[PDB]
Design a protein around this nucleic acid. Structure first.
Ligand SMILES: [Cl-]
Ligand SMILES: [Cl-]
Ligand SMILES: [Cl-]
Ligand SMILES: [Li+]
Ligand SMILES: [Mg+2]
Ligand SMILES: [Mg+2]
Length: 136
RNA sequence: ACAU
DNA sequence: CGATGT
Protein backbone atom coordinates (compact mmCIF):
# COMPACT_ATOMS: atom_id res chain seq x y z
CA UNK A 1 0.00 0.00 0.00
CA UNK A 2 1.46 3.31 -1.17
CA UNK A 3 0.36 6.60 0.33
CA UNK A 4 -1.73 8.66 -2.08
CA UNK A 5 0.13 11.95 -1.67
CA UNK A 6 -2.32 13.87 -3.91
CA UNK A 7 -4.98 13.97 -1.21
CA UNK A 8 -6.51 15.91 1.67
CA UNK A 9 -5.94 14.67 5.24
CA UNK A 10 -8.31 15.61 8.08
CA UNK A 11 -8.27 15.07 11.84
CA UNK A 12 -9.86 16.23 15.11
CA UNK A 13 -8.30 17.70 18.22
CA UNK A 14 -9.87 18.51 21.55
CA UNK A 15 -9.51 19.74 25.11
CA UNK A 16 -11.49 17.14 27.02
CA UNK A 17 -13.58 14.39 25.43
CA UNK A 18 -16.32 15.48 25.49
CA UNK A 19 -14.80 18.94 25.46
CA UNK A 20 -13.71 21.78 23.19
CA UNK A 21 -13.51 20.34 19.65
CA UNK A 22 -11.62 21.58 16.61
CA UNK A 23 -10.65 19.99 13.30
CA UNK A 24 -8.55 20.80 10.27
CA UNK A 25 -7.71 19.64 6.77
CA UNK A 26 -4.19 19.68 5.34
CA UNK A 27 -2.41 18.89 2.09
CA UNK A 28 -1.09 15.38 2.72
CA UNK A 29 2.19 16.06 0.91
CA UNK A 30 3.12 19.53 2.17
CA UNK A 31 1.18 19.81 5.42
CA UNK A 32 -0.31 23.13 4.36
CA UNK A 33 -3.43 23.87 6.39
CA UNK A 34 -6.32 24.28 3.94
CA UNK A 35 -9.12 24.77 6.47
CA UNK A 36 -9.52 24.80 10.23
CA UNK A 37 -12.74 24.99 12.21
CA UNK A 38 -13.12 27.50 15.02
CA UNK A 39 -13.18 25.60 18.34
CA UNK A 40 -16.63 24.31 19.27
CA UNK A 41 -17.18 24.61 23.05
CA UNK A 42 -18.58 21.11 23.69
CA UNK A 43 -18.48 18.04 21.45
CA UNK A 44 -16.94 14.60 21.02
CA UNK A 45 -13.88 13.36 19.20
CA UNK A 46 -16.07 11.40 16.78
CA UNK A 47 -18.39 14.30 16.01
CA UNK A 48 -15.31 16.34 15.13
CA UNK A 49 -13.87 13.58 12.94
CA UNK A 50 -17.24 13.37 11.16
CA UNK A 51 -17.52 17.12 10.60
CA UNK A 52 -13.92 17.16 9.35
CA UNK A 53 -14.66 14.61 6.62
CA UNK A 54 -17.89 16.29 5.53
CA UNK A 55 -16.19 19.68 5.46
CA UNK A 56 -13.49 18.11 3.33
CA UNK A 57 -16.09 16.76 0.91
CA UNK A 58 -17.63 20.22 0.61
CA UNK A 59 -14.22 21.88 0.23
CA UNK A 60 -13.14 19.54 -2.58
CA UNK A 61 -16.51 19.69 -4.34
CA UNK A 62 -16.50 23.50 -4.37
CA UNK A 63 -13.02 23.42 -5.95
CA UNK A 64 -13.88 20.72 -8.51
CA UNK A 65 -11.17 18.48 -7.05
CA UNK A 66 -11.18 14.69 -7.37
CA UNK A 67 -8.58 14.16 -4.62
CA UNK A 68 -9.38 11.55 -1.97
CA UNK A 69 -9.72 12.31 1.74
CA UNK A 70 -7.66 10.49 4.37
CA UNK A 71 -9.18 10.10 7.83
CA UNK A 72 -7.82 7.99 10.67
CA UNK A 73 -11.29 7.59 12.27
CA UNK A 74 -12.85 4.18 11.69
CA UNK A 75 -15.99 5.58 13.32
CA UNK A 76 -16.37 8.74 11.25
CA UNK A 77 -15.60 6.99 7.95
CA UNK A 78 -18.51 4.65 8.67
CA UNK A 79 -20.78 7.52 9.76
CA UNK A 80 -20.13 9.35 6.48
CA UNK A 81 -20.73 6.17 4.47
CA UNK A 82 -24.05 5.73 6.33
CA UNK A 83 -24.89 9.46 6.17
CA UNK A 84 -25.67 9.15 9.88
CA UNK A 85 -23.56 10.22 12.87
CA UNK A 86 -24.53 7.89 15.73
CA UNK A 87 -23.16 10.03 18.56
CA UNK A 88 -24.03 9.35 22.22
CA UNK A 89 -23.54 12.99 23.22
CA UNK A 90 -26.47 14.37 25.24
CA UNK A 91 -28.54 17.12 23.57
CA UNK A 92 -28.66 20.18 25.87
CA UNK A 93 -28.01 23.89 25.51
CA UNK A 94 -24.25 23.33 25.93
CA UNK A 95 -24.11 20.82 23.05
CA UNK A 96 -26.63 22.57 20.79
CA UNK A 97 -23.96 24.15 18.56
CA UNK A 98 -22.15 20.95 17.64
CA UNK A 99 -25.39 19.02 17.26
CA UNK A 100 -26.64 21.67 14.82
CA UNK A 101 -23.41 21.29 12.81
CA UNK A 102 -23.74 17.49 12.82
CA UNK A 103 -27.39 17.61 11.80
CA UNK A 104 -26.54 20.06 8.99
CA UNK A 105 -23.63 17.89 7.81
CA UNK A 106 -25.94 14.89 7.56
CA UNK A 107 -28.41 17.07 5.67
CA UNK A 108 -25.69 18.08 3.20
CA UNK A 109 -24.76 14.45 2.60
CA UNK A 110 -28.44 13.67 1.92
CA UNK A 111 -28.77 16.50 -0.64
CA UNK A 112 -25.48 16.31 -2.60
CA UNK A 113 -23.40 13.85 -4.59
CA UNK A 114 -19.68 13.15 -4.52
CA UNK A 115 -17.21 10.62 -5.90
CA UNK A 116 -14.44 11.51 -3.39
CA UNK A 117 -12.83 8.32 -2.06
CA UNK A 118 -12.72 8.37 1.72
CA UNK A 119 -9.66 6.34 2.71
CA UNK A 120 -8.42 5.05 6.05
CA UNK A 121 -5.00 6.45 6.87
CA UNK A 122 -2.88 3.42 7.81
CA UNK A 123 -1.36 4.74 11.03
CA UNK A 124 0.22 1.38 11.94
CA UNK A 125 2.31 1.52 8.74
CA UNK A 126 2.72 5.26 8.07
CA UNK A 127 2.70 7.01 11.43
CA UNK A 128 0.34 9.75 12.51
CA UNK A 129 -1.97 11.34 9.92
CA UNK A 130 -0.51 14.64 8.72
CA UNK A 131 -3.48 16.61 10.16
CA UNK A 132 -2.82 15.29 13.68
CA UNK A 133 -2.87 17.86 16.48
CA UNK A 134 -0.34 16.25 18.81
CA UNK A 135 0.11 17.20 22.46
CA UNK A 136 -0.66 20.55 24.07
C1' A B 1 -10.82 -7.02 19.02
C1' C B 2 -10.40 -2.59 16.11
C1' A B 3 -10.02 2.77 15.44
C1' U B 4 -9.56 7.55 17.50
C1' DC C 1 -5.93 6.52 34.17
C1' DG C 2 -10.93 7.85 31.49
C1' DA C 3 -14.01 8.97 26.97
C1' DT C 4 -15.94 8.21 22.14
C1' DG C 5 -17.31 4.78 18.92
C1' DT C 6 -17.96 -0.21 15.68
CL1 LIG D 1 -18.60 21.96 10.73
CL1 LIG E 1 -12.06 2.27 8.33
CL1 LIG F 1 -8.22 6.88 -4.26
LI1 LIG G 1 -8.16 11.15 14.14
MG1 LIG H 1 -4.85 12.96 15.64
MG1 LIG I 1 -4.19 13.63 20.47
Amino acid sequence: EEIIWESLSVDVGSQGNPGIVEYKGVDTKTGEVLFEREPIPIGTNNMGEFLAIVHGLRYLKERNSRKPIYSDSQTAIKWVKDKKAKSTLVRNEETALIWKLVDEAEEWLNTHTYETPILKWQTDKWGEIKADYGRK
